[PDB]
Amino acid sequence: NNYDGDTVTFSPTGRLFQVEYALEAIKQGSVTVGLRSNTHAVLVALKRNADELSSYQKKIIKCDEHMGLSLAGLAPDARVLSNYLRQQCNYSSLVFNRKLAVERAGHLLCDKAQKNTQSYGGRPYGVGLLIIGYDKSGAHLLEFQPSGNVTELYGTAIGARSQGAKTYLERTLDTFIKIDGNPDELIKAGVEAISQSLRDESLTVDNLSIAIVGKDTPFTIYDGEAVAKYI
Amino acid sequence: QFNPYGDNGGTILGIAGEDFAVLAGDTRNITDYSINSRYEPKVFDCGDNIVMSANGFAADGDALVKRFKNSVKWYHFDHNDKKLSINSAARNIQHLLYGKRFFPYYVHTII
Amino acid sequence: GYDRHITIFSPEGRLYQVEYAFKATNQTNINSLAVRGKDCTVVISQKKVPDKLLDPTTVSYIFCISRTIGMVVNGPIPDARNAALRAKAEAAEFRYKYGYDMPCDVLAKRMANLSQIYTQRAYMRPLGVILTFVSVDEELGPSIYKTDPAGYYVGYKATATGPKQQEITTNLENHFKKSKIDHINEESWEKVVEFAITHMIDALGTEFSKNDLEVGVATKDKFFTLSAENIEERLVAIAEQ
Amino acid sequence: GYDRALSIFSPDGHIFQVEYALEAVKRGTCAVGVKGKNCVVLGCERRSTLKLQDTRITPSKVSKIDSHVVLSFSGLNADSRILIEKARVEAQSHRLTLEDPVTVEYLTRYVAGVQQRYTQSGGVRPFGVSTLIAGFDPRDDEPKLYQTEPSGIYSSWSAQTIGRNSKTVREFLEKNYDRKEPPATVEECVKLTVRSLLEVVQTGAKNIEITVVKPDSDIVALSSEEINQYVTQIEQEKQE
Amino acid sequence: GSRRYDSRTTIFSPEGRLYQVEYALESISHAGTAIGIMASDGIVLAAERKVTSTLLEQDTSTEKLYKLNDKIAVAVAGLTADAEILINTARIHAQNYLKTYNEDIPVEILVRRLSDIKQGYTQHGGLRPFGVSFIYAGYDDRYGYQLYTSNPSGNYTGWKAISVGANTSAAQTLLQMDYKDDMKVDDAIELALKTLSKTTDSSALTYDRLEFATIRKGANDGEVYQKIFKPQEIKDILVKTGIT
Amino acid sequence: DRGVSTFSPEGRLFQVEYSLEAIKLGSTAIGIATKEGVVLGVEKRATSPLLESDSIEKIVEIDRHIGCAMSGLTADARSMIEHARTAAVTHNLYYDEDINVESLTQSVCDLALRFGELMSRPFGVALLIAGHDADDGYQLFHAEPSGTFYRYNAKAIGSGSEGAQAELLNEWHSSLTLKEAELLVLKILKQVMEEKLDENNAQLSCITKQDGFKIYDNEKTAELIKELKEKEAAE
Amino acid sequence: TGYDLSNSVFSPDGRNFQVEYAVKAVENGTTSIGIKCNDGVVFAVEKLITSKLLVPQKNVKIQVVDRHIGCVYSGLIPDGRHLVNRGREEAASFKKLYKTPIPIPAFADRLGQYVQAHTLYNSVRPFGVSTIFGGVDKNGAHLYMLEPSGSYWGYKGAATGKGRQSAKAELEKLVDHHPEGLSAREAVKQAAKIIYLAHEDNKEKDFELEISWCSLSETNGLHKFVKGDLLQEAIDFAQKEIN
Amino acid sequence: MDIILGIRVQDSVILASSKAVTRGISVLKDSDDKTRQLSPHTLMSFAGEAGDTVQFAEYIQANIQLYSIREDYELSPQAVSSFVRQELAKSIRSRRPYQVNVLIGGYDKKKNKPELYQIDYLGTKVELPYGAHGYSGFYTFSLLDHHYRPDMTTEEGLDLLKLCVQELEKRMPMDFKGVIVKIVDKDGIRQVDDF
Amino acid sequence: MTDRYSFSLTTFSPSGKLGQIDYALTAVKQGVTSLGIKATNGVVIATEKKSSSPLAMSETLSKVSLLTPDIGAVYSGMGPDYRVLVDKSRKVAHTSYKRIYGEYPPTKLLVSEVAKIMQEATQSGGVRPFGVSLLIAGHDEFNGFSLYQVDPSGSYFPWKATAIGKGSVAAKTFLEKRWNDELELEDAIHIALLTLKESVEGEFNGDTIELAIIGDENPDLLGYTGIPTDKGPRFRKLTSQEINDRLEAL
Ligand SMILES: [Cl-]
Ligand SMILES: [Mg+2]
Ligand SMILES: [Mg+2]
């Protein structure tokens, strides 16, 4: 009310309204799902168009050969944060000949987002990210919120009506976690998960976006006719 | 006075055919009259079907190859995984090299 | 009325932020007192440790700024420690630059100048503290100099600070009316500490255990704080008279 | 450094600081530009609430940017000096690097760019000035007349006016200027310019300034008597 | 942050006026009147001191009239402290020009630069403008004798006769009435004093409430002399014209 | 007042949303993409008859293979075009090749959110970027001050956009010829424009692989206008 | 009024309302504690299991500074990480110049001054965390608790978060019942019990226990996480006491 | 670098400047004009390090032209020479100084007098009846010391100048490929085409 | 972080007033009375030492300060603001004058420098004006003795005699009746003490009054001999005893 003019102001109950309004931009964003087994990690994203004449806004971005994310909210902010991750992954490779741990990737994003919530003039990032990766400790899935909070999960979803997929994955937990050494089945579980967040619209060929990374699989994205297999 | 350059010896050779190309190089690495390694490769696969060698001062050679390999990586990121053509790679390497015009990479480069 | 939020003048020529910083001074509800002997300067302060979980040895508002200078603070501990660290750095730099130990009054002026800046510059708030500096200066002898959020400072024959400062002040005034001198006419610092505690007891009307007090003593070439047992030894001496 | 974003969007999509800068232009003395077949004429109103003026030394309303291009304006006088100075410096810088004087379009484009920059830079307000820039490109005999405004938009005009009561004189020019046949001579162009100012001015005494620019750096300012002859001639034809 | 307390000194009103410039001019209208009159053989500067006290040291005082160089002087109306900042800048600027070209600075060039500095404070920096209006009186070999005025907006204009500060409306009407082009310095001296005497808010115009100066070619052959009048000289010139 | 980079309670940036209102006040610009080329057309909208309309420059070349049309506060577009041209030429210098249309658009859109308390406010202009490259062929992009860009088969921006877009929804198909697209832009511009459409108050342009980006002459457009009127009367 | 709208502004009381508002954010956070023992310190924290989908043991909240200091906090988690990052920079520069690892009181003031600095200007926001931290140095064991204002003290036991009062009451009993001292292995067990008892104030979601410790004898003066057999033993001890 | 001469007579200033541009063992050009018009009645000839000469000359030209437009007025030759001197005096203590020597010939319209200023790269200014830079002076000054009168006509000055060029063409080691001669007087600047 | 206050805190109101300067002058009005009187062979500046507590040692707080050997200053208003102005004034006398000309600045020019510092606090970003009016007395070879008043705006005026602060209105009227152009230094000291008694309420002695003069050179206060041209400071602070001697023949 009187305490939402900027990020540097606390409300009387200890809330940061600008951070909460940034969180609100994610809720308006199109649904995206993340889930993993012990061998692979999968991102599934529902893309959104302006109208029937327009393209479908790309939701998934590659960060390294072993890491990448999906976005929900302000896309330019995702570009800034993904670019930062690309550099951090790259620094680790050039300087230490070391693939950046997915956990460190999360810590780095948390700290970058945090600085924008404590200083005057700046604004919080207006996007949520789901980071998947395969490193020296196996497969990983992270959830980034622009409050700074990063959380490691077996599965999750963010965006509009993400609660449907999140409930589904919570039920399916014991099943999909043991889909080891089978990419197509782990994707099928993710495609079924994102289907619980659909209303009036269904998954088409230029609507669905899937990404996968794993033990013997570099981070690769599937669009167009390559996702027809899963509809 | 500190001399930032050295000579690691060796020699390289590139020949082009009709539908192929070779880039060869000996694996010996030296300083003065001593052998450092009998097998230290200096011809590298940089991706996008480009092979590269920067022969002369190995520290500069490795740095340049490292930078170009990284340039290929970012070319993909910035231009929708487009393949870097050999002519585009050549022009890119010119800028890498000339960027250090007043403190040169002490190498002869072939791709 | 934004003239009450930053350090600019109000229509009546006042600086409300400075005035409110003065009120922060009493937020700890602790009273301090300083007196001078012939050879020494004694400062005492109440020590209130309400929480049982606190480590009482770490609860202190007296600071050793340099080997010769001590400082007691009336105000919240974060601002108190901010002032202490700066004072320590200033005293150290002075010695390096000018080849001799920073005098108590010069440090007081310097810290007062820094405080003044916060009353004139908008981006910096005043510290909600009152700083009492004590030493036995090699030129001026026993010295008490006190700084406040307005940037004011002055030397003292003796002084007191806190919520019940006026009672202690008049108590000391009445003694110096009687004694007719500028200091406590006593040889040992031990008895000057005893005087300080005695007159604080009379003014406040409370009794003190060894853990209810905190004592700093400045002599030639060193300032030091007393342990609980040093104070207990001192409390026993008062009781047996 | 002072950083405040002074020029910002409002809910309806307007930048009020830019729009209020236009109000400053509307307050300024009227300025008019008319281009003929072989010349451009810049006319300027001078308010007569100021007697005891020294016209020798008082800043003239029309300024030479180079020997071949001129700039008049409407709005804040102090603001205009900053634009004129920058324009003059760029004129010499262009001659130095390109080895050719500026085109009137280029000079206009530069001045307009400066004005635009002040509408989305922190800590600055927009220029309270609109300009009329006129002249001839090097080795060219085609007349050029351009207009700029605080927002930064610029465009070419066969004839145009800016400042107070400019809507009245624009009305006049819109029915009195034939695109198919522009004022064929210098005399015709000056007369149409003087006529248009007489719709708004008051007395044709020391209230009107006229500057004539012809090809190949041929710029001259008319004196009182020369202008007064146009005023005298127009009024006698009017009584009919 | 600090946005809360920003007055925004360099913005436009909905009508297209600069608030702070307008309010600075309002401030200047309460300052003591200063008059400049340009004759064919010299210039007069006359200014009224702001309500004087009898214990003020009058001879070693300078409030209204300042020397910029040997050929140029200014009359001040507004905040004196603000004026001195600008005066020192103007003095330095004149010397920079002399150092560069080995010629005394033309009056307009000096006036323009000082006016440009004022302009800057109205367009950028977020600072309050200088609450000062100048009357510049000077000579150079291009235009001869010149009078200018500048105000907080940074706008300057040339004049034959002009007033700044208090009662300019009444003062300008009186100057416009009695001024003519073939006027001499001694006539201009009389007009300046007569105008102040009628427009003053005081009971009667006396020597102790005035500063006076002339810029003549009344030295010896083709050179200019600045005369900042002493108290006794103002007392005499006030008697000579029959005001006291 | 309030921060320039402030979020609304609905999760949108106030300044970005307000700049979108400025663009709605702008003159209409339409783009249609075909397999034979991309056509760009704009309403000039002269504020007065004395203004020489050919000096109104709302269609602009970025490189030989990329063109651009604008709508809104058109003065704001100058630095966007300058950046686009430099980005295009710089890439050619570094890589001895033409830069992809999408990469160009992304580079322009990187400027968009570089405002706050960088420039003081967002851009008040939307761009239609049309071009060709070897990888993705003929492309049309709509670049907004939000920093977002969509690829379009056809798109209208400006005051008559929502009406024109609805018309483009019906008319566009994947087999349109270049000539068909030219007429379609003219037709839809004539529908949403205030004043009557002619060669002086509307401008056409196109980009083809063979001839690159070309702005049409007033003579060429006039014949396409005459061809359009005759075809509508013919049934 | 309006005194609470800007950081570093004194109210007529002499208070900085913005700091007090940051304290509300801390009170909203999960419970964390610190127990000082014979030759070291023990840290524990409540991790609310929001969902089944959280990977157990893999969202670590306790942080190490240098090799001998542990830090835990309640409130805005990102703010706590920022403070630890600074703490690590401070500890590194101390060791760089002075060779010896940073003493705990020295380290405590480094954080204190930094947090206090964020109450001096309106262009920064106060920290939305209370931080419990400590370790072992040349003078033995030290436990500290730092608040948004920059205020910190040494503690025998410390607690912050939603279940601070419950935890404090339980801490006070240990101090009374063990005047001679508590052992490191005992303090680990007690820490588990207190987190479980403090969980009653946050009992909708069930939780995950996390413990760490520094001890001169048990961990050789270095910070280590309690895992495996020692953790499960501590969990079982806590489970037995609630029933 | 090469022969720049200057002679101030009764009513005009005459500047003669060699036409050769030599680099190594090759004369690259034999028609080079080593001069710039700073204003209608002010001409500057220049001579020194390659590149520096023209870069400096044109920079000065731009500044004087900028001044002319701003004030709608022509600076006096004295004022221009002082500006030029200061620029060189700044330059000599820069990281890389301008190695350029100049002569400034001007006609002061207010004084109705010709004026010749000699300024070297250090910023050493002198007003002279006749001037030269480089080795040229070693030959021509004794010749001018003898034959020069302050009341000479422009024609007499040109004959005096022919005598200097003849002496230089006889005793100088290089072929400087003749001179371009320009006259500065009340009517401005004009070039003598047949010399 | 960093000083984000890069804008003026003193601005013109619609009526033309500079609010913060007016309010600073109001703070000066509340301040304790100080005065200055110029004689033919010297200048006297005086003020009351308002003690904050009887436990305070008012000797340690100096309201009258030496700026140069021939210039002294006193004030009315906010003490802390005055203290830092004296520090800056002493330094600027060296940096912008003595280190250039090898001699101390004349009174008018040092005053001019202090005025500049006070003017800048009225226009620069993120600062309030100084809440003091200064009276600066001094001597220099070519101007003789002088007395100046400097206000929060940065304006300065030369005075024959004047007062500032609490009871300045009455004190100025008192000085008008007594001042003539033939006053000797001792006569001016006498009048200064008389004028000050009117505004002082409590104790009136050498311990509650602070008074200094600018008069003859004091070779005994120089600290060295051997250089004939160096003859000692003209500024001298009267002792507590010296004041009481003159209060008997009052
Ligand atoms: Cl200091
Ligand atoms: Mg402040
Ligand atoms: Mg020479």
Domain spans of chain E, in order of start: 1-244
Both tokens of G42, joined, read: 């023990």
In CATH terms, the fold of domain C1-241 is Glutamine Phosphoribosylpyrophosphate, subunit 1, domain 1 (3.60.20)
Helix, strand, coil distribution of chain F in percent, nearest 5: 40, 25, 35
Distance CA D71, CA D113 (A): 15
Is there a contact between B50 and B111 (Cβ–Cβ < 8 Å)?
yes
Is there a contact between A24 and A17 (Cβ–Cβ < 8 Å)?
no
Both tokens of D139, joined, read: 């080795």
Q: Indicate the resolution in Å.
A: 2.9
Distance CA H68, CA H70 (A): 6
Calculated CA dihedral for residues G117, G121, G127, G131, nearest 10 degrees: 20
Distance CA C79, CA G186 (A): 37
B77 in contact with A, Cβ within 8 Å: yes
DSSP category for residue B18: S
Distance CA G38, CA G184 (A): 7
Instruction: Put the strands of the sheet holding E34-39 in their side by side order.
Output: E161-164, E34-39, E42-48, E210-216, E225-228
Distance CA A183, CA E64 (A): 89
Domain boundaries, chain C: 1-241
Q: Three-class SS of residue G51?
A: coil
**B vs A contact (3+ beta-carbon pairs below 8 A):** yes
Closest-approach residue (CA) in chain E for H70? E109
Both tokens of H28, joined, read: 């690259």
Both tokens of B92, joined, read: 């890119």
Is there a contact between B110 and B68 (Cβ–Cβ < 8 Å)?
no
Q: Report the largest interatomic distance among the alpha carbons of chain E, rounded to a whole angstrom.
A: 65
Residue type, position E11, single letter: I
Closest-approach residue (CA) in chain C for E4? C2
Min Cα–Cα distance to chain C from I161, Å:
26
Residue numbers in A near B77 (CB within 8 A): 62, 86
Residue type, position D34, single letter: V
Distance CA B107, CA B94 (A): 13
Min Cα–Cα distance to chain A from E18, Å:
27
Q: Three-class SS of residue F115?
A: strand
Both tokens of A74, joined, read: 């302000």
Residue type, position E126, single letter: G
Q: Where are the beta strands (DSSP E) in A37-154?
A: 40-46, 60-64, 67-73, 127-135, 138-144, 150-152
Distance CA A89, CA A62 (A): 11
Contacts of D67 (CB under 8 A, 6+ apart): D101, D217, D219, H69
Both tokens of G106, joined, read: 């020295």
Distance CA I209, CA I195 (A): 12
Give Cα B58 distance to the centre of its chain. 10
B94 in contact with F, Cβ within 8 Å: no
Cβ–Cβ below 8 Å for E16 and D77: no
Give the angle subtended at the CA of B46 by the CAs of B42 and B52, to the nearest 5°: 45
Q: Which ligand has an atom closest to residue C117 CA? A: 2
CA atoms within 13 A on the CB side of I145: 25
Is there a contact between E48 and E167 (Cβ–Cβ < 8 Å)?
no
Q: In 3D, which of A115, A129, A122 has the Cα closest to residue A85? A: A129
**φ and ψ at residue H19, rounded to 5 degrees:** -100, -10
Closest-approach residue (CA) in chain D for F123? D120
Cβ–Cβ below 8 Å for E141 and H76: no
Distance CA I10, CA C155 (A): 35
Q: Three-class SS of residue F187?
A: helix
Contacts of F44 (CB under 8 A, 6+ apart): F27, F53, F56, F58, F200, F201, F202, F203
DSSP category for residue G46: E
Q: In 3D, which of E84, E40, E95 has the Cα closest to residue E62? A: E84
Cα separation values, A111 from A117, A124, C190, G11, Å: 10, 12, 55, 32
Residue type, position I245, single letter: D
Render G190-223 in DSSP notation, one character per residue: HHHHHHHHHGGGG-SS-EEEEEEEEETTTSTTSE
Is there a contact between G16 and A20 (Cβ–Cβ < 8 Å)?
no
Distance CA H166, CA H171 (A): 9
Q: In 3D, which of C109, C113, C93, C100 has the Cα closest to residue C139? A: C100
Both tokens of G228, joined, read: 């495996």
Contacts of H103 (CB under 8 A, 6+ apart): H4, H5, H6, H15, H44, H45, H46, H116, H117, H118, H119, H131, H133
Contacts of F152 (CB under 8 A, 6+ apart): A50, A53, A54, A55, F31, F33, F140, F141, F142
Q: What is the CATH number of the domain that holds A166?
A: 3.60.20.10
The catalytic position among G1, G30, G100, G131 is G30
Distance CA G227, CA G211 (A): 8
Domains observed in chain D: 1-240 (3.60.20.10)
**φ and ψ at residue A206, rounded to 5 degrees:** -105, 20
F224 in contact with D, Cβ within 8 Å: no
Selecting from 3.65.10.10, 3.30.2130.10, 3.60.20.10, 3.40.50.300, what CATH number does the domain F1-235 have?
3.60.20.10
Both tokens of C9, joined, read: 């003048």
Q: Three-class SS of residue A140?
A: strand
Distance CA F112, CA F122 (A): 6
Min Cα–Cα distance to chain A from G87, Å:
14
Q: Which residues pair with A62 in a beta bridge?
A: A68
Cα separation values, A112 from A80, A88, A104, A123, F147, Å: 11, 12, 12, 12, 20
Distance CA B42, CA A80 (A): 36
Distance CA G134, CA G41 (A): 7
Q: What is the CATH number of the domain that holds G19?
A: 3.60.20.10
**E vs A contact (3+ beta-carbon pairs below 8 A):** yes
Q: In this structure, how many other beta carbons lie within 10 angstroms of the beta carbon of residue E95? A: 12
DSSP category for residue A74: -
Render C207-223 in DSSP notation, one character per residue: ---TTSEEEEEEETTEE
Q: What's the CA-to-centroid distance between F202 and ligand 3, angstroms? A: 66
Distance CA I160, CA C225 (A): 56
Residue showing tokens 């909708």: G204
Q: In 3D, which of D197, D213, D193 has the Cα closest to residue D205? A: D197
Distance CA G150, CA G16 (A): 12
Distance CA I96, CA I113 (A): 9
G89 in contact with A, Cβ within 8 Å: no
Q: Tell whether the torsion through CA atoms of C97, C99, C103 and C105 is positive or negative.
A: negative
E115 in contact with D, Cβ within 8 Å: yes
**φ and ψ at residue E109, rounded to 5 degrees:** -60, -45
Cα separation values, D84 from B3, D69, D90, E93, H20, Å: 55, 11, 10, 21, 41
Active-site residue flag, G30: yes
Distance CA D95, CA D68 (A): 12
Domain limits for position H50: 1-195
Distance CA E137, CA E72 (A): 6
Domain boundaries, chain F: 1-235
List chains touching C (3+ CB pairs under 8 A).
E, G, I
Q: Tell whether the torsion through CA atoms of H58, H63, H66 and H68 is positive or negative.
A: negative
Q: What's the CA-to-centroid distance between H3 and ligand 3, angstroms? A: 14
Both tokens of F101, joined, read: 């249309």
Cα separation values, I73 from A103, I63, I183, I239, Å: 67, 8, 21, 17
Min Cα–Cα distance to chain E from C123, Å:
8
Give Cα G236 distance to the centre of its chain. 23
Residue numbers in E near I118 (CB within 8 A): 81
B7-26: string of b/e by CB count within 10 Å (b at 16+)?
Answer: ebbbebeeeeeeeeeebebb
How would CATH label the architecture of E1-244? 4-Layer Sandwich (3.60)
Cα separation values, F87 from B90, F63, F82, G220, Å: 20, 10, 9, 59
Is there a contact between I148 and I158 (Cβ–Cβ < 8 Å)?
yes
Residue numbers in C near I29 (CB within 8 A): 13
**φ and ψ at residue D136, rounded to 5 degrees:** -135, 135
Distance CA D181, CA D165 (A): 26
Q: Three-class SS of residue A70?
A: strand
Cβ–Cβ below 8 Å for G124 and A119: yes
Q: Are strands A67-73 and D40-45 parallel, antiparallel or unpaired?
A: unpaired
Distance CA G209, CA G232 (A): 10
Give Cα H136 distance to the centre of its chain. 13
Phi-psi region of G213 (alpha: psi -120 to 50; beta: other; left: phi over 0): beta
Task: Report H:76-95 residues touching E (Cβ under 8 A).
Answer: 76, 78-79, 82-83, 86
Residue numbers in G near I2 (CB within 8 A): 123
Is there a contact between A47 and A71 (Cβ–Cβ < 8 Å)?
no
Burial class (CB in 10 A: 0-12, 13-18, 19+), H188: middle
Is there a contact between E74 and E110 (Cβ–Cβ < 8 Å)?
no
Is there a contact between G238 and G193 (Cβ–Cβ < 8 Å)?
yes
Residue numbers in G near C6 (CB within 8 A): 9
DSSP category for residue B32: T
Residue showing tokens 């405004």: D149
Residue showing tokens 């209303």: A199
CB pairs under 8 A between A and F: 83
Q: Which ligand has an atom closest to residue H85 CA? A: 3
Min Cα–Cα distance to chain F from D158, Å:
6
Q: Tell whether the torsion through CA atoms of A145, A151, A156 and A162 is positive or negative.
A: negative
Q: Three-class SS of residue B95?
A: helix
Give Cα E117 distance to the centre of its chain. 17
Min Cα–Cα distance to chain D from E44, Å:
15
Contacts of A226 (CB under 8 A, 6+ apart): none
Domain I1-250 sits in which CATH superfamily? Aminohydrolase, N-terminal nucleophile (Ntn) domain (3.60.20.10)
Render B70-86 in DSSP notation, one character per residue: HHHHHHHHHTTT----H
* Length of chain D (residues): 240
Q: In this structure, how many other beta carbons lie within 10 angstroms of the beta carbon of residue G51? A: 17
Closest-approach residue (CA) in chain A for B65? A94
Contacts of D207 (CB under 8 A, 6+ apart): D45, D46, D47, D48, D201
Q: Where is D211: in which H helix or E strand?
A: strand D208-214
C1 in contact with E, Cβ within 8 Å: no
Calculated CA dihedral for residues F97, F102, F106, F107, nearest 10 degrees: 20
Q: What is the CATH number of the domain that holds H92?
A: 3.60.20.10
Distance CA E216, CA E237 (A): 16
Q: Where is H16: in which H helix or E strand?
A: strand H13-18
Q: Where are the beta strands (DSSP E) in F25-182?
A: 29-33, 38-43, 59-63, 66-72, 125-133, 137-143, 149-151, 154-157
The total of structural domains in chain G comes to 1
Distance CA G71, CA G53 (A): 26
D214-226: string of b/e by CB count within 10 Å (b at 16+)?
Answer: bbeeebebbeeee
Closest-approach residue (CA) in chain G for C126? G120
Distance CA C145, CA C107 (A): 9
Give Cα H55 distance to the centre of its chain. 16
Q: Three-class SS of residue G15?
A: coil
CB pairs under 8 A between D and H: 22
Closest-approach residue (CA) in chain G for E4? G6
Q: Where are the beta strands (DSSP E) in A32-111?
A: 32-36, 40-46, 60-64, 67-73
Is there a contact between A102 and A131 (Cβ–Cβ < 8 Å)?
yes
Contacts of C95 (CB under 8 A, 6+ apart): C66, C101, C102
Give the gyration radius of chain G's Cα atoms. 18
Residue numbers in I near E131 (CB within 8 A): 12, 16, 18
